[PDB]
Design a protein around this ligand. Sequence first.
Ligand SMILES: NC(=O)C1=CN([C@@H]2O[C@H](COP(=O)(O)OP(=O)(O)OC[C@H]3O[C@@H](n4cnc5c(N)ncnc54)[C@H](OP(=O)(O)O)[C@@H]3O)[C@@H](O)[C@H]2O)C=CC1
Ligand SMILES: [Zn+2]
Lengths: 297, 96, 143, 208, 143, 115, 86, 125
Amino acid sequence: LHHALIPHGKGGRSSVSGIVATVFGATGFLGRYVVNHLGRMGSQVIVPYRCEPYDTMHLRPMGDLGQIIFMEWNGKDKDSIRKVVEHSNVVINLVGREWETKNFDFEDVFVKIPHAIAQVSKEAGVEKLIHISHLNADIKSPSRYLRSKAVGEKEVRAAFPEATIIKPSDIFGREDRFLNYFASMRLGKETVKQPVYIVDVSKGIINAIKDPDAKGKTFAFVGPNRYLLFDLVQYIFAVAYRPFTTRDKVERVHMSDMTLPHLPGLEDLGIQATPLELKAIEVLRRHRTVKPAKTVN
Amino acid sequence: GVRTSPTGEKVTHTGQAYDDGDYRRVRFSDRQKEVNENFAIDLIAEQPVSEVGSRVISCDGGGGALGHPRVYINLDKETKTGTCGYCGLQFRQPHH
Amino acid sequence: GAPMADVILPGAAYTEKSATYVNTEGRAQQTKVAVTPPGLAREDWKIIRALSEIAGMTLPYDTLDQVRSRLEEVSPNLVRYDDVEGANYFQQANELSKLVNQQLLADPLVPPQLTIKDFYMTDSISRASQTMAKCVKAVTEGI
Amino acid sequence: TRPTIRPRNDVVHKQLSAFGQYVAEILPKYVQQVQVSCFNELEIFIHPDGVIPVLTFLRDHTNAQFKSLADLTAVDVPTRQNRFEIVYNLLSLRFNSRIRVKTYTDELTPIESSVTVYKAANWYEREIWDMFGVFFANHPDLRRILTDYGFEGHPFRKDFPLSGYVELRYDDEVKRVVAEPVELAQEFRKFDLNSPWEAFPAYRQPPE
Amino acid sequence: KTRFAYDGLKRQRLTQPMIRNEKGLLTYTTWEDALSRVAGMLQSFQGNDVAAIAGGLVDAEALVALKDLLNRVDSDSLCTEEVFPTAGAGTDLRSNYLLNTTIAGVEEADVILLVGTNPRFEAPLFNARIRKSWLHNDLKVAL
Amino acid sequence: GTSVKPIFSRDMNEAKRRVRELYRAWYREVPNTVHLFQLDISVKQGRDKVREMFMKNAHVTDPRVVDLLVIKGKMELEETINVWKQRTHIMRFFHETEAPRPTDFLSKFYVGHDP
Amino acid sequence: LGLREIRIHLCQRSPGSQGVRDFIEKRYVELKKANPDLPILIRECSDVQPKLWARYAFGQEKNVSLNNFSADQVTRTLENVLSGKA
Amino acid sequence: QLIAVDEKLDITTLTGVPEEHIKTRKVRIFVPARNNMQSGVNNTKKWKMEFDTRERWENPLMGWSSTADPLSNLVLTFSTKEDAVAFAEKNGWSFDVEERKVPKPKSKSYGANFSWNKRTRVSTK
Ligand SMILES: NC(=O)C1=CN([C@@H]2O[C@H](COP(=O)(O)OP(=O)(O)OC[C@H]3O[C@@H](n4cnc5c(N)ncnc54)[C@H](OP(=O)(O)O)[C@@H]3O)[C@@H](O)[C@H]2O)C=CC1
Ligand SMILES: [Zn+2]
């Protein structure tokens, strides 16, 4: 099994876990948590970055000496992808932009880039590939974001048969847009949301790395309880002690969260989902200058 | 005499070179592998063998106090040539 | 013994485990861990216990001290680590040995270790040593 | 005795021996032994209960008046039943002299604090409690002075590992500094520098 | 052999579990897979169908663990490579298969008889002790 | 014989009383610490942690050891009162960042050679 | 229900094992005559109670003490063990 | 003034050692063996207490040796066996103690080399 990756040590910072992971788009909200979880157990991380190396500095102190290697890349060139995933045995894809750009539209971000990554990883001998798409991703969705997500999911499955598709649902956390977006407005009663904690998503990804039977499975990462939009916003504003993104985001938030009971979730990976009540105060303490919202199940 | 690995890297004078399957090779991408071009074994193998007419010869590496500790080498064996322990220079009696 | 196997379980060498060996005098002595087994190799009794628990026939012992207590139960002598004295039961064994009357064959007693060249390579560790191969080559032909 | 050998002074040796006998005569209840080293250093071994009296004597007697407390420290010798050894170093300015007082204690036996005698002892006593775990009774405030808050164990004991048990780092998931079990990239290489062929026959011990 | 055969500890080492694949070759797997296959095969069979052979470098802990494991499946086919005559007392009497006089007690003997043995290469330290007693105690040797 | 010098308590009753007073102080202080240090835990979690740390040393049957532990606990409580610590020092009691080590034989057999 | 082997642990110098020792020195060979296939291991203890261990099918083991037992007592409990009666 | 309590000493809860490093370690109390390369015997006078060896692995970067256990480099010196045993019991460590080995007295005679009839005659000197 290519001895260099035989696990060693007690699973600490200076141990060896036998994981060589390439985390595409690791400079985002979820990428930092994924890279931190990978590096705290001694795994080697390859970070492909397209931004200024200054913006990636926060990832440096999350690994031991020589365990994090930063590499330049871009989605328009397959050679950079080939040289980035050449030696990795795990490839995690977190590339995704929530808005349009004159260089990268949703089709480029969510379809062509994941397809190229999956094809190059298959050609390079990578054994594990993890791809992340939205939970509500449907080919018939009104929004282009979810249609592209749906098309991308099919492409990865076609190119990488042994890929693992993970479908989180509106991740919330310290740097998430789900809570900060609603706390920065300073309409509902028919739409329900199922937020999921960021650490839970990162641990689910890590366990999917470790789990051997999760080769071709598809997961749906959802929270413990469902919230109507109105009372969830009420709770968000109450935590902050505050009295009560162009066109695609409003449509996307106005859609109701889907239900997929056939798809396995966090419990199948041995993770107990953390309710929003425990971490809402931690997230929203910085928006300042208790009666939790009712749930529907 | 720097060789090249079958993968493509240069082999160090100690013979170290990552094989095809080693993941640690990724540390050299977009960078370089530090290798010393001058090999001590090749440089010392091309030194001429000194011809002295004494049974026992003294070597201090040249320079006196700037060399190695002074040692004495016996040259009775006519099959091979006496080699200094530190410096690696060779000495030989005048056969024939 | 390896290529003829169907499942191979990597064990530990005598320098990689705290293990009990009894010499030819009946004296029991224990080794100490100098290094750890390479790769994914594990201790032999640990492998046996894990296999037993997987199969559902879980063994009572969990740690080394419990295995040595089991050894004491099976045999009292094994726990002592420098005692060599024992009872003399020559009479009973001798009297029991006079029943069967097998005959000797007309073959001379030739030991396997006829010459120094046969002494170097005896077990698996010796056969895997370059030094032993050098010794055998030097003994067979000298320069 | 050529210029490579440290010269020996006999007058100071005689004076220190005489003063040691004098002190041991005055306080026979507490002093257990008196020694004078080959380099003219006088030390007094006393009972633990005599810390307050003896020190006070050495600070107040017209013939001793050891006014200054130069140092106060502890020595750990695990092979002894009384593990810790407390050392007081006193300097007398009037007579231009130095003395040493040695006491023994263990983990659970407390030693009376000498803050009343010497104020300078205060922090020193705390330091001992921080490094060895010796408790000093009737101390104005006894707490850690050198180790981190919440540090578990006393580092200067001989059975405490050199690198400790925990190490600090920064975690971004919890956005704070956290403590983990210690894991070294390179283990501290232990060297067996001690050699056979004893060097000092004058310190040879009986073969019991 | 004791002094210079440690080199073999660095060659031909078994580091990972191995199982036979579809083509019949040995391929690396995890501990869980190999243990599951072995446990399934051990559960399917029972009695004299299971057996074990102990090598020449196995410790007492592994021996007793394997004995317990094969006893939990009602088996007694526990064998070693070297043979010992079981007729009569066999292994029930401990003094029937030991060096009773002991290496230290060799020095007190005055005559010795060696039967079908080459102690120089089978037990070099035993032969060294015999030689020392022969040189100092004027011991008489017959082979 | 085995006569020893006391520290604070002559027998086990006085040591138990001092343990009780220290527990009262910690129980009273937990909510103030939670509010002041702006912890993410609740008062229930802090009180449960205090109870667990007290019950960790429940097998001690020596009055000297008991009242030395009481002295250490009083020192730590005083450290907590005056805000000499920070959030990290308080939160080191919960090991939220350390992976959970397993207990059964099979898991320890799989991870490594650690007994 | 089928006996597989028996073990007799006796202490060489202790007096509590004394009679047990006599047992062997008088009749063990005769016992081995009656059971040419049953393994009766004999081992030495040290400051421990003399004991007899019997192993039945599938790994069941039962132990019985032998302190201060006379030769008749130990041979009697032995015949009880092999005969299967309890 | 004196408690006069009768119980064994135990300072396990005061040393601050982690629980996994108390009930899992196995200390060894022994007189270190003489180094066979030298004839000096000055290193076999005191008793040594040392902990068992644990895992060491190769560092992925630079190839150094890494150890995950703190007590690996620890060694303690004791005057007698009883003191070391008492220390081990007081700290709550399970211990294995080995009796000191001393070379037996040997009778050496110069006269034996030139023996008239015995086999101790030397072939050369
Ligand atoms: N609400 C949520 O956050 C949940 C996340 N989603 C999915 O989870 C994935 C990651 O989420 P998240 O980390 O929060 O998103 P972020 O916007 O925070 O991070 C996006 C990452 O992808 C990189 N990236 C984005 N666009 C490009 C591009 N055109 N070319 C190259 N790199 C690019 C970014 O690099 P750079 O900064 O340098 O541009 C960045 O590193 C995404 O695929 C998203 O779709 C799943 C459910 C919702
Ligand atoms: Zn030279």
